[PDB]
Amino acid sequence: GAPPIMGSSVYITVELAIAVLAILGNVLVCWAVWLNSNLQNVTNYFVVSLAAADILVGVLAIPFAITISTGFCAACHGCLFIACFVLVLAQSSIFSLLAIAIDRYIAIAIPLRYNGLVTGTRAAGIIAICWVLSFAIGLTPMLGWNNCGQPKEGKAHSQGCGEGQVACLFEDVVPMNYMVYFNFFACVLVPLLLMLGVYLRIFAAARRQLADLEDNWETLNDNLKVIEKADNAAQVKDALTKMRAAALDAQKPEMKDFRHGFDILVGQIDDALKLANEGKVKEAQAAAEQLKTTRNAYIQKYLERARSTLQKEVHAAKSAAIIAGLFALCWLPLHIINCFTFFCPDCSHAPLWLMYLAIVLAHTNSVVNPFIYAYRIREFRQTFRKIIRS
């Protein structure tokens, strides 16, 4: 058995490196949102809350994890707090990630009433509530669901702990049924599955809306061909009645030129419709040919800006789903190991070095979020450069 301080020195040094990187990167995230007003929206208010929890990981959780790895003597309820405070920050992260996904779903499913529904003041109240719930969930062991009533008295005396103290070890004080049933299944796994379902609805909604923009555009062009090769006044009326419905369906600085374009489009369809109802088929086809001018000058531009906006919303949702996916990737090994500890008492406990590896991997998550915003969000990246240069 090698001396514990050799392996502990590597673990501590890595933990301190992660703490420094988590603090620096996420203080930069908060600084960027504080200065740049283009970054000041509801989505980024949860981003800041998410970054604040990552800051507290390096300031408190990582020093707590270094402390509780030594198994020092402590009063059980005080030992419970340094054991469970990281569960509060992990819970806070989950609420912020679920809020970001829900916020993006509202922006893409009901964009007309997004600003009136999702406001900045309601977001700050939600964030306050989620932090209160995160403390209550994460510090539930301090409410009585703990093993302080049955202290390992042999381990406490072997380390010279005083009366009323225990050897502060996570799996000694935190019950494993809490970690698996309450923390993992109820408070971690179910919300992550809810995020997955929200993102699936987001990408399904975007794909359908792009589909609708391509259908109405093709409906417009196909009915134009029908009018050209028609032979009576009834075929022209049938095609124009479809375009007028598709134009009004599609109508539902640049907002003034696009409203003018659809006023021309629907108006010209009406001109050709009246000429068709009068039996003037040749005059109706010529009036419908003026629609091509309106299409190339106004309607084709609306379809490309609407296509561009939806593509930006997909990219933004993909970036947010990457954040929530890496969170699961970084925390699931720790939760899976707890499942083996709890559900298989005949299996040997996962080796200590694998425990150290899982703990470090979970802490690393507090570093990766500032890199995703830099590589995937131009507004964050450009603000990051201006902060670092200045």
Ligand X SMILES: CCCCCCCC/C=C\CCCCCCCC(=O)O
Ligand Y SMILES: CCCCCCCC/C=C\CCCCCCCC(=O)OC[C@H](O)CO
Q: Which of residues 5-34 bind ligand 9XT (CB under 6 A)?
A: none
Structure tokens at 378: 């131009």
Residues 344, 352, 353, 375: which binds ligand CLR (CB under 6 A)? 344
The interface mask with ligand 9XT, positions 148-187, x = CB under 6 A, is ----------------------xx-------x--------
Residue whose C-alpha is closest to residue 60's, from 71, 52, 48? 52
Q: Does 162 bind ligand Y (CB under 6 A)?
A: no
Binding flags for ligand CLR, 79-118, as an x/- string (CB under 6 A): x-xx------------------------------------
Structure tokens at 251: 């109508």
Q: Choose one: 205-213, 261-269, 293-301, 367-375; the region binding ligand X (CB under 6 A).
A: 367-375
Residue 131 within binding range of ligand X, rule CB under 6 A: yes
Strand partners, 73: 167
Rg (CA), the chain: 30
Using CB atoms within 10 Å of the CB of residue 160, give its burial: 0 to 12 exposed, 13 to 18 middle, 19+ buried.
exposed
User: What six digits make up the tokens of 303?
Assistant: 């379809």
Q: Check residue 121 for interaction with ligand CLR (CB under 6 A).
A: no
Residues in 63-82 at the binding interface with ligand CLR, rule: CB under 6 A: 74-75, 78-79, 81-82
Per CB under 6 A, 353 contacts ligand CLR: no
Q: What's the closest the beta carbon of residue 350 comes to ligand CLR, in angstroms? A: 4
Of the pair 298, 373, the CB lying nearest ligand Y is at 373
Amino acid identity at 54: D
Judged by beta carbon distances under 5 to 8 A according to partner kind, the member of ligand 9XT, Na ion, ligand CLR, none in contact with residue 93 is: Na ion
- Site mask for ligand 9XT (CB under 6 A), range 47-76, x = bound: ------------------x--xx-------
Phi, psi dihedral angles at 167 (to 5 degrees): -70, 115
Q: Which residues contact 42 (CB under 8 A, 6 or more apart)?
A: 103, 118, 119, 120, 123
Q: Is the CB of 54 or the CB of 172 nearer to Na ion?
A: 54
Q: DSSP string covering 54-101, please?
A: HHHIIIIIHHHHHHHHTT-EEEHHHHHHHHHHHHHHHHHHHHHHHHHH
5-13: which pairs have CB atoms within 8 A and are 24 or more residues apart?
A: 7/353, 7/356, 8/69, 8/70, 11/66, 11/69, 11/356, 11/360, 12/66
> Using CA atoms, how far apart are residues 100 and 47, in angstroms rounded to an integer?
8
What is the C-alpha separation between 44 and 67, in angstroms, rounded?
33
Q: Which of 104, 237, 295, 335 binds ligand 9XT (CB under 6 A)?
A: 335
Q: What is the Cα–Cα distance from 131 to 136, expressed in whole angstroms?
A: 9
In the complex, the smallest distance separating the C-beta of residue 47 from ligand 9XT, rounded to whole angstroms, is 22
Shortest separation between residue 6's beta carbon and ligand CLR, angstroms: 23
Per the CB < 8 A criterion, the answer to whether 66 and 363 are in contact is no
Closest CA to 42 of 127, 130, 129: 127
345 binds ligand CLR, rule: CB under 6 A: no
Name the residues that contact ligand X, by CB under 6 A.
7-14, 16-18, 20-21, 24-25, 27-28, 30-31, 34, 55, 122, 124-129, 131-132, 135-137, 139, 142-143, 192-193, 195-196, 199, 318, 321-322, 324-325, 328-329, 348, 351-354, 356-357, 360-361, 364, 367-368, 370-372, 375, 388
Name the residues that contact ligand Y, by CB under 6 A.
30, 33-34, 40, 45, 48-49, 52, 55-56, 59-60, 63, 66-67, 70, 72, 74, 120, 123-124, 127, 131-133, 136, 142-144, 185, 189-190, 343-344
